[PDB]
Amino acid sequence: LQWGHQEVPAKFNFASDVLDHWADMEKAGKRPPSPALWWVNGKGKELMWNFRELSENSQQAANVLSGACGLQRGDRVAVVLPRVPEWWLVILGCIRAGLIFMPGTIQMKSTDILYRLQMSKAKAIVAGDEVIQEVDTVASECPSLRIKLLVSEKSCDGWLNFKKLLNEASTTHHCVETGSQEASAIYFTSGTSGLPKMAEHSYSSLGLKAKMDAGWTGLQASDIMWTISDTGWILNILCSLMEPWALGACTFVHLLPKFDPLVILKTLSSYPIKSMMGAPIVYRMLLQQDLSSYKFPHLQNCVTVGESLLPETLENWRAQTGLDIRESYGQTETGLTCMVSKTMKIKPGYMGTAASCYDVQIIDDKGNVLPPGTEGDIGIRVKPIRPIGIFSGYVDNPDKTAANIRGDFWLLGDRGIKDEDGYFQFMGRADDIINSSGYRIGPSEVENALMEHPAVVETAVISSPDPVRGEVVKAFVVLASQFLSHDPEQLTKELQQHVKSVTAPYKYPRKIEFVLNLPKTVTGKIQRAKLRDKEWK
Amino acid sequence: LQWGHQEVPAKFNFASDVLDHWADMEKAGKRPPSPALWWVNGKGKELMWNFRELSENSQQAANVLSGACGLQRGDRVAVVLPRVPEWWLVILGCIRAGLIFMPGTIQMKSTDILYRLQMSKAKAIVAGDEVIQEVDTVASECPSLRIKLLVSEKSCDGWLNFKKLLNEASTTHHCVETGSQEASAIYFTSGTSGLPKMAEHSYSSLGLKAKMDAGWTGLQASDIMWTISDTGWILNILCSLMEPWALGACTFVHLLPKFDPLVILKTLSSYPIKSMMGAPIVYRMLLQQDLSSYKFPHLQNCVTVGESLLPETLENWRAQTGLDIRESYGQTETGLTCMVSKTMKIKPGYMGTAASCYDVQIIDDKGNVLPPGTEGDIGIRVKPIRPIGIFSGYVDNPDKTAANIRGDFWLLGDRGIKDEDGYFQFMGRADDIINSSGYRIGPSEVENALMEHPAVVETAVISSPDPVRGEVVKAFVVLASQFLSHDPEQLTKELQQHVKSVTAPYKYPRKIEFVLNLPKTVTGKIQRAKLRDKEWK
Amino acid sequence: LQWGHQEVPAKFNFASDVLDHWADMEKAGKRPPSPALWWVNGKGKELMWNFRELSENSQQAANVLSGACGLQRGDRVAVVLPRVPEWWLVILGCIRAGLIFMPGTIQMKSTDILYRLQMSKAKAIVAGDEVIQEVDTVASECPSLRIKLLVSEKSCDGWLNFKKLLNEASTTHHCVETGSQEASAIYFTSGTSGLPKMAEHSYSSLGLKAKMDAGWTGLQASDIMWTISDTGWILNILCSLMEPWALGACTFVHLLPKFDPLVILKTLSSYPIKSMMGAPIVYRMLLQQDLSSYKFPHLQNCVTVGESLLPETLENWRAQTGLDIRESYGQTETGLTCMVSKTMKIKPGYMGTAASCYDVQIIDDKGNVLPPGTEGDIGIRVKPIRPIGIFSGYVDNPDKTAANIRGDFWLLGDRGIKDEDGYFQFMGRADDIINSSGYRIGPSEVENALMEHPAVVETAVISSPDPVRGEVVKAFVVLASQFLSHDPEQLTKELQQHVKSVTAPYKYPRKIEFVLNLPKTVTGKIQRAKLRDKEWK
Ligand SMILES: [Cl-]
Ligand SMILES: [Cl-]
Ligand SMILES: [Cl-]
Ligand SMILES: [Cl-]
Ligand SMILES: [Cl-]
Ligand SMILES: [Cl-]
Ligand SMILES: [Cl-]
Ligand SMILES: [Cl-]
Ligand SMILES: [Cl-]
Ligand SMILES: [Cl-]
Ligand SMILES: [Cl-]
Ligand SMILES: [Cl-]
Ligand SMILES: [Mg+2]
Ligand SMILES: [Mg+2]
Ligand SMILES: [Mg+2]
């Protein structure tokens, strides 16, 4: 592999190279104790760590994982937690202990969990009260799974008490001398067909890339950033963790147990958050609140990712707050790929210019660069030199990795147009992936869930336009002859509840259309593009 | 004149006959919007026109020239611009408006400009920031000069703002019904003695000739060609403009502000350029770069003109890239005269066979055809029928035109040998013209510059062999007795700087030899041939 | 793996980094054309390459391999050639083309070859007339084997003509940008039990290690070295190739078709060889010749490896020639491990001090360092940092690699004592490996060969002391009851011929003892140590 070769130091570790620099600055008296992590639950509990405390407590976390739990360098650890401090501590702990962290959403059902534990052959899971039961439904079928660590006020037979072990642990752990290319994280990522793939990131593709992008958000050393994210998304590691800590800035975490926009607004108004990051829906939701009542003159930087930002949202936000929203763009495999930086003119409807050292282009069917103003596929040049930030590949599936390289370019799977200044406009997914709010949904995940129901003999799942949410999961369902006599509204509701019971509810089909047939290729494949084309005007 | 008579239609215009065919194909839906002009500055700005846009924008250009500027059919327009899109637009505009365009290099000094404006009696000049000051030094002495159009981000008192007028102009202009033999361009061309002559080309000698040669380069309709040229050279009109547009292909333009070979290499590697054209120096420079690092597997056709291609350059290029270089040959008066086409065997050291409908021969002192393997003068048969592509003659100087006809043959002024297959080998200039890289230098231009200095009482300028550049300008200088005590290296440097200050720097004498005398004919002419003979071994 | 981590540049390639430096020095005029390879056949043919010619001709070799043969980066190439220039060219060619070369001896029989081709899944073999027939006996059973390249004056159906393709090939090849840790060579190496393992070396463990040791032999830039070696031994790559070429010195190769000591002596006397390297047997053989008749006052450096140098050989050599022999020590996995350098006092019976950056120690059963004067196992410290020069591991067998690490130390498998100055004395093999002259013999290889014969129902192969050769292969053979009536001298001769017919003849048992039984552990293993102990007094 020319792919494995990069322009990187032999060794890199975000914890020892970045976080412990700040800890050492404090200890040496060269910087005052500076807030690193500020967590609130919105019910009167708050916690704050400075960089020395964060380093000490994450060293304890690494001692729990490597010492009490006996996990060894290279072991894979599923992490499925709400927005609690232990998420940040445990990730840092894995980084310190040379363990591969694998974040997932607390929305996951038992089948989602079993798929991931079996595929990854995880040695450990760190979970909270939200998924303990779902984990225990399937853990017996996971022969590799040896450690269950629970983050909770409760104890549970079979699970180790993370919070108790952390307090018992030493605040000294010797950071593993991890290699730049060594596996650090696995993120499961949905595909255009089939079930989620394991996208492997290295110590450098996450942490060195973040160190190089540090400040892209407008954030500075003495500021506070609030990234609003599910802890399972790669957004959480890149923006909630690595962006602020590369700068020695504070990251702000609200438990946000119900995603309540009035709570978000009161939080912005009551805490001195200078920068925020959330998906476009966050800003859309906030705009439906009374912004006149909860001012936030301390807020300066508003960034977004995950779905295209409507010029209308941008307009309304500027009108109600006086602030810009600066769009960014990326995927799990590539991290931050394009963005509008704090010094760039904003062009409504465009998501900015190439990030970092990426050579991002619009390319043709042959993999050749197209001129400005021509629609094609968005790619990043990865040959002959793979830039810092691109993932290591799909785990156990180098053919899938190679499949997505066209000529010298990694394909994002998005259509786009580049203007005369190099700014990109998103022109839609080039494949069958569905983007519902932040979430990336593979149609086979949803089709499979539906097919389990006895009513469904065939189904195609596509994206569908929505006025409030933008894009939703829609299912075309062919019924067993027996269910033709059933009330469609009743059966739709039943099918939706079924999908929500069996897989993470964010994937459920908000729209179901019953049909007698679905269009087929001569190989018998459903023509989703054809259905999507009709569906979107 | 039997000379004026040709086998041509009564009317021809490249813009209406060729360019607007492609524009109309797009508009009619018979061809998809196809790239015509793709310009980059190498700092992140790119612009592309399709054939409809190119036609619209050049119609605007013609409206600026004929409408806002009041220029009338037959008016002569000096064009002195860098490699910016407005060069292509303005030339097309002149073609549309039946205006005689007269390109020159941005390397020109005020004296060069005044000579050309006064000789031509130009009504207009189109210039950029590179020469505005030089133009303004002398414009008051040019009574015919009425319009100064500046292509710039700046405005300047006395100059019309081309870019602003173009945007204000209509995209509809009715193309002048120009005659086949009507003057379209004047190119100033250096002579063996004296100062540059005005070589007049017609609508047909440029555009119909190009239409007939279309594809000689190997270029096809859906390809991109990069011709690397000074915009003042006739090479730019024939290969950067007319060759690709006769085919409906895209022409690629890089500003290339510094002629940086690493920039050329990165450009070849990063853009899907299928054909390239440059003088041999371009390929020589590229060969000194790391071609292993910047591959260009999309490149298929490499053509050259302007200086003889060393078999060594040909060899090295094939070794490092796997590609041939196909040589071509021509002069300002004749356009493309010989070449190696894409289907011809390459014979190293030969420049191919007669182009187009040219009867190219080696001829004797009487104007008779010589057998293969005999050195003589290269000529094109122009009587009794002057072939399409030969210029109309030297403006105001029909005696100079006639002087260069020997029997039935136009003399190229080069020596050559023709082989058994009709392939020509260049055997050197037959006169005192100096060829330094692409540039054709008349010795009187350089001698005159030198004589202006008080040290120089006599001088002869000849070509001299050079290992790196091939051929250079050398001056023999007889000193005023007063300067005999001066340090020669100091005075050489001073004389070189003087020549560079007074005339386009490409002509400067890279070598100066101080001598006490120069050999004279009985008419008192310096014997340059004698000096050149000694100089070249 | 902390093992994979090293203090090395990301990229290394001996050909581009070392050899092409010397080639470029010549081309740039900064060094005169300097001999690189001087080959003689001892019948009046000689050939010499300078560094430019060596680079050109090896670039041709790389073009044969990658171009004509279509071999791709990472493909494995068996090389089985006599001492001809094409060995050096082909190895360099593989290095340039990022191909894994796998040298073996021309003494190999068809079964030896099939084992290696099947184990390695080689895509190609480069062979000469010595093994073509043996290769063709088994090549059909090697589904991965696609290319057979023959180095010969003859052509053979099925084999490509290497010498013809090389001459047809371009002298320009763009060196692959190989990684420091990327596989460069596989050497098959015998084990204490079972059949030979694949020892993988990297671009850096061979070439960067050699660059760092360059000159250990006493060799300088303007000298000639003669390494006397089978081309299959790692000695050939480290000392015949990399040591002289790291220095810009000449390597001298004599075909030496019969290993004739009078030929070696006449060669030393007739050519200005300043340094020589051979196994102790070379010097022993030379000492039986008339050194008074063939003086070599130009010879300055005599080095040895492969078997312990008797103080008697050292003494006799000094007495007859006035020269020292400087001992070195290493194995396939470790390269040059200890040696007596040109500035070190020679202590008869000791093999010098740790090479390069190796921390070489005598260690106990726990892996702890022992004091001077205590016998233990020779080890190299490989944790936490594996030094440059240690191989990458056994291919497909990381458990075998790990098996030989005791604590933080790679085990050489030799016993030794270290003196107060750090000099090591060899105290014998710690396992069942047999060292006969240069050759390392695994007993299972020989036992297996013998067991194929119907007379042999059981056998143990051990080392045995020999006055002339030092150590020989001895077989204990238990006979089938049917062969008890056979003449032992006849049957011994027959068994020896059998072993020589089926496997490389260097392994054959020079001594056979017929016995009625062999001592067994409670697991039923033959106690070879017990037999060897009795055998050696
Ligand atoms: Cl909105
Ligand atoms: Cl406001
Ligand atoms: Cl997701
Ligand atoms: Cl590139
Ligand atoms: Cl050259
Ligand atoms: Cl090539
Ligand atoms: Cl005729
Ligand atoms: Cl010119
Ligand atoms: Cl001896
Ligand atoms: Cl002696
Ligand atoms: Cl140590
Ligand atoms: Cl061996
Ligand atoms: Mg069903
Ligand atoms: Mg003068
Ligand atoms: Mg037997």
Is the omega angle on the peptide bond into residue B384 within 30 degrees of 0, that is, cis?
yes
Q: Please report, for residues B77, B79, B91, B117, the alpha-carbon distance to residue B147 in angstroms, rounded to integers and kept in the order given.
A: 9, 12, 16, 12
* Gap from CA of B261 to ligand 5 centroid (Å): 14
Q: Which chains touch B (3 or more CB pairs under 8 A)?
A: A, C
Whose structure tokens read 């998906």?
A279
Whose structure tokens read 């005044």?
B114
* Gap from CA of A166 to ligand 1 centroid (Å): 44
Q: Does B111 touch chain C (CB under 8 A)?
A: no
In this complex, the residue of A366, A373, A384 whose CB is nearest that of residue B48 is A373
Whether the Cβ atoms of residue A352 and residue A339 lie closer than 8 Å to each other: yes
Q: Which of A3, A5, A174 to mutate to test the interface with C (most CBs of C within 10 A)?
A: A5
Distance between CA atoms of residues A76 and A101, nearest Å: 6
Resolution of the experimental model, in Å, one decimal: 2.0
By CB atoms closer than 10 A (0-12, 13-18, 19+), residue B380 is buried
**Three-state DSSP class for residue B337:** strand
Q: Among all ligands shown, which has an atom nearest to the Cα of A299?
A: 2
In this complex, the residue of C5, C8, C177 whose CB is nearest that of residue A177 is C5
Distance between CA atoms of residues B465 and B308, nearest Å: 13
* Lookup: tokens for A290: 């009374």
Residue A73: list chain C partners with CB under 8 A: 2
Q: Please state whether beta strands B353-354 and C250-254 pair in parallel, antiparallel, or not at all (unpaired).
A: unpaired
Distance between CA atoms of residues C173 and C55, nearest Å: 10
Whether the Cβ atoms of residue B499 and residue B509 lie closer than 8 Å to each other: yes
**DSSP per residue over A451-488, as a string?**
HTSTTEEEEEEEEEEETTTEEEEEEEEEEPGGGTTS-H
Residue A10: list chain C partners with CB under 8 A: 5-8, 10
User: Mind telling me how many Å the CA of A384 is from chain B's nearest CA?
Assistant: 8
Whether the Cβ atoms of residue C326 and residue C457 lie closer than 8 Å to each other: no
Distance between CA atoms of residues C149 and C240, nearest Å: 23
Cα pseudo-dihedral A233, A234, A238, A241, rounded to 10: 50
User: Mind telling me how many Å the CA of B47 is from chain A's nearest CA?
Assistant: 6
Q: Please state whether beta strands C46-50 and C35-40 pair in parallel, antiparallel, or not at all (unpaired).
A: antiparallel
Distance between CA atoms of residues B425 and B411, nearest Å: 16
Distance between CA atoms of residues A351 and B185, nearest Å: 46
Residue B290: list chain C partners with CB under 8 A: none
Q: Among all ligands shown, which has an atom nearest to the Cα of C454?
A: 15
**A361 annotated among ligand-binding-site residues:** no
By CB atoms closer than 10 A (0-12, 13-18, 19+), residue B236 is buried
**B195 annotated among ligand-binding-site residues:** yes
* Lookup: tokens for B159: 């100059």
| Method of elucidation | X-ray
Q: Please report, for residues C57, C76, C113, C182, the alpha-carbon distance to residue C16 in angstroms, rounded to integers and kept in the order given.
A: 14, 20, 31, 15
- Secondary structure, 3-state, C379-417: EEECCCCCCECECCEECCCHHHHHHCEECCEEEEEEEEE
Distance between CA atoms of residues B307 and B336, nearest Å: 14
Distance between CA atoms of residues C297 and C299, nearest Å: 5
Q: Please report, for residues A247, B242, B280, the alpha-carbon distance to residue B326 in angstroms, rounded to integers and kept in the order given.
A: 56, 19, 11
Burial A21-50 (b: 16+ CB within 10 A, else e): ebbebbeeeebeebbbbbbbebeeeeeebb
Q: Does C170 touch chain B (CB under 8 A)?
A: yes
* Gap from CA of C341 to ligand 8 centroid (Å): 67
Q: Using the beta-carbon criterion (under 8 Å), do B319 and C172 form an inter-chain contact?
A: yes
**C189 annotated among ligand-binding-site residues:** yes
Whether the Cβ atoms of residue C257 and residue C311 lie closer than 8 Å to each other: no
The DSSP letter of residue B455 is T
Distance between CA atoms of residues B474 and B349, nearest Å: 25
**What's the full length of chain C, in residues?**
537
Sheet holding C456-466, edge to edge: C456-466, C470-479, C511-514
What residues of chain C, 173 to 232, have a C-beta less than 8 Å from chain B? 174-175
CA nearest to B290 within chain C: C174
Q: Does B271 touch chain A (CB under 8 A)?
A: yes
Distance between CA atoms of residues A236 and A242, nearest Å: 9
Whether the Cβ atoms of residue C507 and residue C439 lie closer than 8 Å to each other: yes
Helical pair C311-321 and C280-287, crossing angle rounded to 10 deg: 50
Q: Using the beta-carbon criterion (under 8 Å), do B319 and C175 form an inter-chain contact?
A: no
Q: To 5 degrees, how large is the angle CA A182–CA A187–CA A192? A: 125
Distance between CA atoms of residues C400 and C20, nearest Å: 37
**DSSP per residue over A8-29, as a string?**
S-SB--HIIIIIHHHHHHHHTT
Q: Which residues, in sequence order, are CB contacts of C484 under 8 Å at separation 6+?
A: none
Distance between CA atoms of residues C68 and C420, nearest Å: 57
* Gap from CA of C110 to ligand 15 centroid (Å): 20
Q: Does A11 touch chain C (CB under 8 A)?
A: yes
Beta strand segments in C419-455, E: 424-429, 434-436, 439-441
Q: Which chains touch C (3 or more CB pairs under 8 A)?
A: A, B
**Three-state DSSP class for residue A313:** helix
Domains and CATH numbers, chain C: 1-430 (3.40.50.12780), 431-537 (3.30.300.30)
